Design a protein around this ligand. Structure first.
Ligand SMILES: CCCCCCCCCCCCCCC
Ligand SMILES: CCCCCCCCCCCCCCC
Lengths: 346, 346
């Protein structure tokens, strides 16, 4: 059924750029949309302004979008729930404020769309896996793909993938998240793990991309960082039990390539500084997603015994003061090799 | 053996940007390097200047590089031969001037590196396949990857793949083409067909990329054009009998992503014009590689019954006056679907 599905209400927990862009998308398929944001006072300012001046400045919100500081009201009546809360606050939220919400989701069986990306430091678990400790897996899907928020927010042509172990849940969410004007196009996949691994690794890789830029390298080098980096995503995915079908799709390759080329992104600028020789502190004197993700990624890789050449040097450069040029050299120390890609066709 | 191999001589047939960049690379692994170029008078001007002012302006040539209009002298004594002659002149060259050369290559068993990319209009065959009608397959390898010539020429970090059915021939060429400073890094693969398909399709895809830019779309859309475009490369590869292991490597994904983002490239600018509504003639009033490749690609796809959604609309926009917005719409007419990627891991 390529027939879209329209709803009465949707709520988005998480008011940053992407969550807000996604509200914009939903505002066209849902009569009403709420966006949960902890500070009431902020909830005010924003609703007055008709624009999220905190995280999505310049975009005027659709009239059917309303910010609220009240969890219960926020989800009350929602027929789709999206989580965009940062990884680090994710578990806390369910602990302290999601008891009723969970009960609802479960009672009413409301489909949940995980849009949060990262690795929790304490358990080395990804977002949907943490949510899955609270909500049943069948209600769980993941949204991932090349989707800069501003463009998604302004309705500029965007494609994403939606993943669920049960392809059928993914297909339904597909009918809800996809727009009537074909400006937000969803593709179904079963690979949740691949999507989450890619979503998190890409940030780490993006710092490598800036590193390469700050070291004097050019576009050929970025293209190779993306190609070789992807195999690291592929390998960590296998180790975590993913089926890997998203690696080479929009959520893996597609998003990685977009994220590694976002020159003005913080991951990129931080990597460029480091590449230009600036030390982290000084660079430090918000956190780049790749900086925060690098350490838990590395602990996870070590635990699973997964080598991730680029991620590893990126972690050493970020964490252990490694000179970038030395890191490049160590990286280049492997010798001559075969590409490392299996045939597709026998 | 990760040990490099140095040689006395190498020749490059084809004096455009890439062939010249590649001479630059070889000038560091070979005592002497000749580059064959048909016009003597031009051969002069260039050698006087110590720079290829015709196709690689601003790069001063290494002292050990010499242009020559004489085939025989050009290859005489070469221990590696590179072809970079344009597709369309490729067969003509072997017919009219390669009788002795072939005899040599074959007598001395000199490894041949195919760097020409495209589809011959009369036979719908790719470069190495056309060369293979003249030289034995075992002497044949293909070089492909994300490698803008200027950067390769100036020694900026670049990775490429070298393909041969016999991985062992690829590994040897690897030891020759790879630099002592690790600035030009080669990876071995067996997928010749995938490399050639990608090398040619990317140009067609690059026009779609400009089209998207000229239509108002942004980076999310380019990332999706690259991701979906790649499957078309994958599918045509299977049909042609390739093993597909290069699709997701440097020669397929890597190069495609670089080529689709080269904003100032002719494929891109032509696509942007079309996207902005300019008709081909007017745009026409050199040829963009993607424009020339679109028609033979389409005939080849039809003969093999391979659907190539994006390439097809790109051909219709370029060839049959199709309004781009209509093409996008037809393209978007497929309905909702699954991504189309198999699992990697069971
Ligand atoms: C040390 C941080 C990243 C720097 C720039 C890396 C540019 C790309 C290197 C590509 C090849 C990796 C080959 C690994 C065997
Ligand atoms: C008509 C020429 C190309 C225009 C821009 C295309 C942008 C990307 C479209 C991506 C999706 C294709 C889905 C095909 C089913």
């Amino acid at each position: 059924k390529d027939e879209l599905l329209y709803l009465n209400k949707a709520v988005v927990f998480g008011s940053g750029a992407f969550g807000t862009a996604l509200a914009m998308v939903l505002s066209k398929k849902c009569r009403e949309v709420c966006v949960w944001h902890m500070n009431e006072e902020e909830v005010r300012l924003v609703n007055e302004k008709r624009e999220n001046v905190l995280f999505l400045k310049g975009v005027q919100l659709a009239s059917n979008i309303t910010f609220t500081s009240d969890v219960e009201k926020a989800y009350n009546g929602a027929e789709i729930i999206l989580f965009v809360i940062p990884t680090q606050f994710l578990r806390g939220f369910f602990e302290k404020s999601g008891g009723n919400l969970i009960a609802y989701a479960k009672e009413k069986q409301v489909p949940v769309l995980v849009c949060t990306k990262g690795i929790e430091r304490s358990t080395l678990k990804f977002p949907a896996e943490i949510i899955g400790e609270f909500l049943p897996s069948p209600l769980l899907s993941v949204l991932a793909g090349p989707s800069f928020a501003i463009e998604v927010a302004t309705g500029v042509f965007t494609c994403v993938s939606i993943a669920s172990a049960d392809i059928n849940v993914a297909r339904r969410l597909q009918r809800i998240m996809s727009t009537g004007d074909r400006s937000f196009v969803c593709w179904a996949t079963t690979d949740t793990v691949g999507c989450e691994v890619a979503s998190a690794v890409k940030n780490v890789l993006a710092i490598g991309s800036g590193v390469a830029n700050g070291l004097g390298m050019g576009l050929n080098a970025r293209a190779a960082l993306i190609m070789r980096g992807l195999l690291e995503i592929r390998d960590l995915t296998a180790a975590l039990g993913g089926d890997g079908s998203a690696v080479f799709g929009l959520a893996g390759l597609g998003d990685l390539q977009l994220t590694c080329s976002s020159e003005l992104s913080r991951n990129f600028t931080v990597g460029k500084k480091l590449g230009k020789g600036l030390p982290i502190e000084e660079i430090q004197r918000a956190v780049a997603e790749g900086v925060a993700t690098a350490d838990p990624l590395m602990r996870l890789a070590k635990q699973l015994k997964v080598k991730m050449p680029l991620c590893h040097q990126i972690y050493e450069i970020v964490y252990k003061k490694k000179n970038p040029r030395d890191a490049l050299a160590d990286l280049l120390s492997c010798g001559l090799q075969d590409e490392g890609l299996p045939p597709l066709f026998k």
